[PDB]
Amino acid sequence: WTATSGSCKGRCFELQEVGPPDCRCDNLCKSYSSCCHDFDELCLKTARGWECTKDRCGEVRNEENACHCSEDCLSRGDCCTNYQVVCKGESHWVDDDCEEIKVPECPAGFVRPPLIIFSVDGFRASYMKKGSKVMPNIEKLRSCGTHAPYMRPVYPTKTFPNLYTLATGLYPESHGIVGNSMYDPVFDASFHLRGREKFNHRWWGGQPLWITATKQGVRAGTFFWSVSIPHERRILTILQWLSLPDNERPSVYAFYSEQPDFSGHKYGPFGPEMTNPLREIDKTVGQLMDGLKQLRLHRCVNVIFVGDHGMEDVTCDRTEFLSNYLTNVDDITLVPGTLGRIRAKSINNSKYDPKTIIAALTCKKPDQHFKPYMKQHLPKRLHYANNRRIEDIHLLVDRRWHVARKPLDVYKKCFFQGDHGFDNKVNSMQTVFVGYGPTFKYRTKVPPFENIELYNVMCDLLGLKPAPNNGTHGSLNHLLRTNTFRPTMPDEVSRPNYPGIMYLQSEFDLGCTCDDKVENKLEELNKRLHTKGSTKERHLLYGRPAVLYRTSYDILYHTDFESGYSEIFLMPLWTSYTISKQAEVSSIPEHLTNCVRPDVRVSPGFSQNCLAYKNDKQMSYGFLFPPYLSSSPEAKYDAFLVTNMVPMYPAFKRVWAYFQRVLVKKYASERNGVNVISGPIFDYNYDGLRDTEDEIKQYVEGSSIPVPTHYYSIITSCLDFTQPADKCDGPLSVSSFILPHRPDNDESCNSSEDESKWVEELMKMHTARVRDIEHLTGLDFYRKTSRSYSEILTLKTYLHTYE
Numbered sequence: 063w064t065a066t067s068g069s070c071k072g073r074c075f076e077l078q079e080v081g082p083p084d085c086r087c088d089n090l091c092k093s094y095s096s097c098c099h100d101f102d103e104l105c106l107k108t109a110r111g112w113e114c115t116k117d118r119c120g121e122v123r124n125e126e127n128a129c130h131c132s133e134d135c136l137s138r139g140d141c142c143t144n145y146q147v148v149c150k151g152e153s154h155w156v157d158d159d160c161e162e163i164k165v166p167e168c169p170a171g172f173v174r175p176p177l178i179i180f181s182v183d184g185f186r187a188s189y190m191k192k193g194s195k196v197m198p199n200i201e202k203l204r205s206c207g208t209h210a211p212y213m214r215p216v217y218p219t220k221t222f223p224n225l226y227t228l229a230t231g232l233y234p235e236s237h238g239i240v241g242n243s244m245y246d247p248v249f250d251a252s253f254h255l256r257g258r259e260k261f262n263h264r265w266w267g268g269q270p271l272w273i274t275a276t277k278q279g280v281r282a283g284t285f286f287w288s289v290s291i292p293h294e295r296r297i298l299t300i301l302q303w304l305s306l307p308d309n310e311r312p313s314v315y316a317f318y319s320e321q322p323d324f325s326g327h328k329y330g331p332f333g334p335e336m337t338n339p340l341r342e343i344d345k346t347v348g349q350l351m352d353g354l355k356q357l358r359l360h361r362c363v364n365v366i367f368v369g370d371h372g373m374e375d376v377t378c379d380r381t382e383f384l385s386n387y388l389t390n391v392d393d394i395t396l397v398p399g400t401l402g403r404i405r406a407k408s409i410n411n412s413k414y415d416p417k418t419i420i421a422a423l424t425c426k427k428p429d430q431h432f433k434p435y436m437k438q439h440l441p442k443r444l445h446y447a448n449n450r451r452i453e454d455i456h457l458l459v460d461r462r463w464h465v466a467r468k469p470l471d472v473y474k475k476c477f478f479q480g481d482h483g484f485d486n487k488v489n490s491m492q493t494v495f496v497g498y499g500p501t502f503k504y505r506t507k508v509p510p511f512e513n514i515e516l517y518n519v520m521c522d523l524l525g526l527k528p529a530p531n532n533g534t535h536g537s538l539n540h541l542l543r544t545n546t547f548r549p550t551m552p553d554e555v556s557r558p559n560y561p562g563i564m565y566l567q568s569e570f571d572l573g574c575t576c577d578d579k580v581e582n583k584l585e586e587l588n589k590r591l592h593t594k595g596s597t598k599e600r601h602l603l604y605g606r607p608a609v610l611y612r613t614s615y616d617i618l619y620h621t622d623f624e625s626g627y628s629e630i631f632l633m634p635l636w637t638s639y640t641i642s643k644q645a646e647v648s649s650i651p652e653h654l655t656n657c658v659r660p661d662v663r664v665s666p667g668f669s670q671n672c673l674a675y676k677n678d679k680q681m682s683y684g685f686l687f688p689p690y691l692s693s694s695p696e697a698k699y700d701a702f703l704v705t706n707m708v709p710m711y712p713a714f715k716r717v718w719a720y721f722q723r724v725l726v727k728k729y730a731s732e733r734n735g736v737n738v739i740s741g742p743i744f745d746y747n748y749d750g751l752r753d754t755e756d757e758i759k760q761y762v763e764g765s766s767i768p769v770p771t772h773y774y775s776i777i778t779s780c781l782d783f784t785q786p787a788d789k790c791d792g793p794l795s796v797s798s799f800i801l802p803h804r805p806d807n808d809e810s811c812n813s814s815e816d817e818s819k820w821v822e823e824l825m826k827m828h829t830a831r832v833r834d835i836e837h838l839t840g841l842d843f844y845r846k847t848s849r850s851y852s853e854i855l856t857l858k859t860y861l862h863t864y865e
């Protein structure tokens with residue numbers, strides 16, 4: 063109920079919100095159907111239009127007009143944005159040569175530079191270059207300010223997940239808006255694009271920028287705009303707010319445009335009809351900047367121009383139908399489109415089974431345009447699992463395609479040529495970022511980065527303390543002129559032990575054998591130095607990783623590698639080695655095929671044993687440092703120590719062996735040496751975070767040896783590849799993966815083929831950030847470099863995309 067009998071007289075776009083059942087006048091009262099009777103008359107004036115003409119100059123104030131050209135208009139804060147150009151012979155912002163803003167130049171009574179977020183829906187990254195001819199304002203912002211070639215959105219590359227991620231710094235799995243459409247089994251309620259449940263507080267988690275500002279004493283405009291309010295009225299409302307008195311004036315604002323997403327759906331990303339929406343957006347930017355100039359704020363305000371996701375070519379005829387795969391199609395509910403989420407239709411049907419659903423969707427058609435996953439097996443870079451709103455079964459859909467339940471869903475609901483939502487590393491899904499103003503750098507290109515990182519920066523732009531979020535605070539300090547947040551390395555929690563030789567061979571009863579008994583002052587003193595750390599500078603290039611939790615572990619030195627061995631998990635947490643360009647691959651000699659050797663530095667009670675692997679018919683083992691890369695015949699025996707061994711499924715061994723035998727040497731050649739850090743990850747509860755000892759769901763049968771959910775590697779070299787990995791003076795270059803440790807290779811449909819046709823493809827899909835591995839392991843890498851710490855943070859957020 064709303065008693066709409068109140069008035070918006072002197073209340074137009076009020077900032078505080080008045081509670082029911084009184085009538086509202088804010089920029090969202092339309093969407094709630096709760097505006098006062100006179101809202102349109104008073105607050106949405108349209109008369110005479112949005113521009114001053116020559117004949118309106120010095121007119122007599124007529125309050126009916128959308129905006130004004132009367133002499134009193136500047137004091138009132140309500141001129142049309144081109145008033146000074148027509149009536150005072152001033153020039154448009156876009157026509158001025160751009161001059162570095164070295165110091166904020168703000169009017170008296172402005173305590174901080176204000177921030178304006180200019181958000182544009184569906185603004186594909188390539189529009190910046192391809193549309194630059196018809197976007198002079200946006201192109202001036204871009205080239206004078208700070209820009210990225212693109213910004214990576216979050217998955218799913220939908221509007222609500224991405225807009226709320228921008229506002230919070232959180233993965234959708236954490237903020238709770240995991241799609242445009244959601245079912246919550248605990249509330250037993252659905253969230254829809256169209257309807258009233260989406261207004262409920264309970265859906266929205268974390269702490270968005272406007273709330274963070276408010277709680278810390280920084281005033282905010284209201285970010286959201288009812289569709290029916292024209293863009294020109296949005297721009298004027300923001301400029302009016304900027305003219306309020308100091309104690310009433312907000313410091314942070316947002317504009318939002320439904321374009322170009324809206325037209326993009328109809329016409330495709332580059333439909334010839336897409337030029338006009340792009341002109342229109344640019345005209346709107348021009349109005350803002352012209353408007354700020356009039357207020358003398360154009361060298362004072364920080365402006366962020368930012369998109370939520372891109373747009374792809376997608377038609378009716380590229381739809382896969384689940385009814386061509388499943389017999390029991392009427393037993394399932396599908397959330398359809400550019401991603402698929404499946405659950406049971408009724409809670410009271412016990413003949414429903416996910417195992418059989420996945421199976422029926424798995425590599426069934428030669429050309430299949432989607433792949434099923436249990437949510438925990440999705441690539442960890444997507445971070446899309448740890449929410450009760452994300453259904454257990456997920457379909458990742460190929461760019462350009464749809465999934466639907468039955469064909470009727472598509473012709474009785476072609477209309478559309480564009481869509482988005484796909485995997486967030488797909489090129490067509492990337493979006494834009496440009497910062498312009500006093501706190502941003504001048505004429506600066508920065509590398510691509512992810513939208514989760516912005517909340518932190520926007521908080522810095524405003525002097526705010528960000529709420530806990532998924533950004534890495536400091537990783538974007540290179541966008542900023544000043545206002546840097548200067549982070550410090552986390553302290554190490556566990557220090558390592560350094561075991562010498564403490565055990566005789568006969569103390570071990572591991573069921574292992576090795577033919578190593580075939581046997582020198584000079585050369586024995588020398589391998590002893592190797593065990594004490596003499597070649598650690600070669601193999602541990604950036605310091606040892608810090609363990610950021612309470613645990614018990616040993617550092618183990620060898621000729622060819624170094625590891626941090628956990629006495630709790632009975633395996634290394636990490637193993638580190640360097641492979642130069644000149645290094646040769648050898649094979650595992652005949653006599654050492656089944657060789658496993660006891661490590662006289664580590665008690666039998668802290669070791670794996672071979673018998674458990676003998677007995678467990680599903681489980682085999684593999685090695686973290688690869689024997690294929692041993693520097694010498696004598697060094698090769700080090701690679702067979704029971705402390706270099708890790709549990710692997712025979713199907714996964716296929717993937718790992720190819721990686722270690724072929725790919726590592728390939729990267730060494732291509733990058734001029736590589737440093738490799740490899741290890742296990744235990745994430746049974748799929749929260750992206752290291753599991754503790756009491757959370758391990760699977761052990762090698764009959765033993766306390768835990769089975770990893772994933773294996774990672776981090777592969778570092780010199781950004782300038784004319785310098786070797788082990789002798790790099792400058793910035794570093796990195797790529798990483800987090801390979802799921804699966805008992806079959808069902809994920810890769812061509813796996814019955816040679817590893818050269820499918821293994822590297824699988825790794826690319828599971829590319830990762832060093833930061834991703836950090837959360838999963840509780841380790842901190844790159845502790846000792848010659849690089850600045852902010853630069854290292856940037857390196858840790860880097861994702862190698864292969865697009």
Ligand SMILES: *[C@@H]1O[C@H](CO)[C@@H](O[C@@H]2O[C@H](CO)[C@@H](O[C@@H]3O[C@H](CO[C@H]4O[C@H](CO[C@H]5O[C@H](CO)[C@@H](O)[C@H](O)[C@@H]5O)[C@@H](O)[C@H](O[C@H]5O[C@H](CO)[C@@H](O)[C@H](O)[C@@H]5O[C@H]5O[C@H](CO)[C@@H](O)[C@H](O)[C@@H]5O)[C@@H]4O)[C@@H](O)[C@H](O[C@H]4O[C@H](CO)[C@@H](O)[C@H](O)[C@@H]4O[C@H]4O[C@H](CO)[C@@H](O)[C@H](O)[C@@H]4O)[C@@H]3O)[C@H](O)[C@H]2NC(C)=O)[C@H](O)[C@H]1NC(C)=O
Binds near residue numbers: 265268445448449450
């Ligand atoms: C990305 O970043 C985010 C944020 O940094 C990371 O997510 C955080 O991760 C933490 C660890 O996983 C987690 O700590 C929890 O906190 C539990 C209580 O949290 C509630 O309150 C939160 C704070 O709100 C206030 O925030 C500010 C301060 O900044 C205040 O000033 C305000 O006044 C605010 O009110 C709140 O954010 C949180 O909301 C979540 O849950 C709601 C759903 O009910 C959603 O609305 C919302 O979207 C959040 O939902 C996400 O997170 C939850 C997990 O919390 C998850 O279920 C969802 O899937 C979704 O992803 C809460 O309302 C606290 O209870 C926890 O302590 C338990 O576990 C520990 C384990 O050590 C035990 O010691 C302890 O006993 C306790 O266990 C008890 O309960 C168990 C289960 O019932 C039981 O087994 C046991 O026996 C015990 O009884 C723990 O400390 C943060 O909540 C979380 N924050 C957010 C926003 O998500 C994330 O990890 C990062 N991701 C990556 C990959 O790095």
Ligand SMILES: O=C(/C=C/c1ccc(OC(F)(F)F)cc1)N1CC[C@@H]2CN(C(=O)N3CCc4[nH]ncc4C3)C[C@@H]2CC1
Binds near residue numbers: 230260288
């Ligand atoms: O104008 C906006 C958004 C502006 C904006 C600007 C910057 C942002 O990013 C950041 F953080 F970087 F600044 C994020 C958003 N929108 C967003 C899309 C939906 C939201 N909505 C709703 O009806 N609801 C969504 C939210 C909300 N608040 N109160 C009710 C409702 C329901 C209708 C519709 C209006 C237009």
Ligand SMILES: [Ca+2]
Binds near residue numbers: 744747748750
């Ligand atoms: Ca976990």
Ligand SMILES: [Zn+2]
Binds near residue numbers: 184
């Ligand atoms: Zn969108």
Ligand SMILES: [Zn+2]
Binds near residue numbers: 221323324327482
């Ligand atoms: Zn859209």
